[PDB]
Design a protein around this ligand. Sequence first.
Ligand SMILES: Nc1ncnc2c1ncn2[C@@H]1O[C@H](COP(=O)(O)OP(=O)(O)OC[C@H]2O[C@@H](O)[C@H](O)[C@@H]2O)[C@@H](O)[C@H]1O
Lengths: 89, 89
Amino acid sequence: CVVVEGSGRVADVIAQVANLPVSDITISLIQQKLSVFFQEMFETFTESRIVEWTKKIQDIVRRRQLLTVFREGKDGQQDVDVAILQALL
Amino acid sequence: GRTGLRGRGSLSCFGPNHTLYPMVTRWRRNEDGAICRKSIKKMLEVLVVKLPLSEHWALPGGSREPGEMLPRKLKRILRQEHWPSFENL
Ligand SMILES: Nc1ncnc2c1ncn2[C@@H]1O[C@H](COP(=O)(O)OP(=O)(O)OC[C@H]2O[C@@H](O)[C@H](O)[C@@H]2O)[C@@H](O)[C@H]1O
């Protein structure tokens, strides 16, 4: 799975927690980064939704092999192709 | 330390002139009634006064020349007359 940086809500909150160690995720940090990007519906979040999304983001960023960020390099803004090839390999 | 002016000035007496500054605080709710949120912390509301020749908002705090009605010395005309003593209780 390749995520694209500078795109939207869920993309940015996955892309920020890419290179982080797996134990360094705090459930406080999740809702902190969540409510700024979800600032339209940030107040619509409950604690059970926060712990579910924290568990899911944890179990995703565990498997570091199967994920890549596009990084939105934005100096050439080359293609999706350069990302998709490394995410294949 | 030193201030640069000898004397009493516009103060009542020498030394300290004792006064009480009360503050009222409450939370700031959204359209739903939940707490509005900052980046991390929350939003707070205080009740302030503006005098016609002060050109400034300030706390309703009075000189502690009377004992218990020093908030009333700030807020007899502001708060109430009889219910003011109840809120002072
Ligand atoms: N900590 C302070 N910070 C800023 N200004 C101050 C402070 N303390 C006093 N002042 C200013 O000093 C001036 C004289 O002080 P007082 O008159 O003793 O203060 P107070 O009794 O709280 O204000 C009386 C108010 O009634 C009006 O007639 C007059 O315009 C004044 O705003 C006031 O205009 C007040 O704005």
